[PDB]
Amino acid sequence: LQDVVNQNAQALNTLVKQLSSNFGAISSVLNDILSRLDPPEAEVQIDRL
Amino acid sequence: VIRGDEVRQIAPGQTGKIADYNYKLPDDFTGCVIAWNSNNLDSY
Numbered sequence: 001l002q003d004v005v006n007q008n009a010q011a012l013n014t015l016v017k018q019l020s021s022n023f024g025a026i027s028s029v030l031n032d033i034l035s036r037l038d039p040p041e042a043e044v045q046i047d048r049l
Numbered sequence: 050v051i052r053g054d055e056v057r058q059i060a061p062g063q064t065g066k067i068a069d070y071n072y073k074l075p076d077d078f079t080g081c082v083i084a085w086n087s088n089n090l091d092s093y
Contacts, residue, residue: 040062040076 023048
């Protein structure tokens with residue numbers, strides 16, 4: 001029974017921790033990349049994420 | 050009529066006086082841009 005709770009909590013924690021990955025974007029923060037990069041190429045950056 | 054200095058600005062996703070105050074093209078423009086020197090005809 002404890003393993004079900006552990007596995008669900010772990011999968012969910014991994015799912016949220018994936019938001020810190022850049023995937024090749026200049027930065028993982030959408031507002032940070034959007035705030036300094038012009039739309040025609042901020043689109044390219046945001047697509048990877 | 051435009052001047053060769055910043056004539057390249059007539060294009061999607063460009064910045065400058067022309068593209069930001071005079072004539073701005075959309076990002077998904079579909080079509081062709083044509084230019085030619087007109088010194089013999091146009092040269093305040």
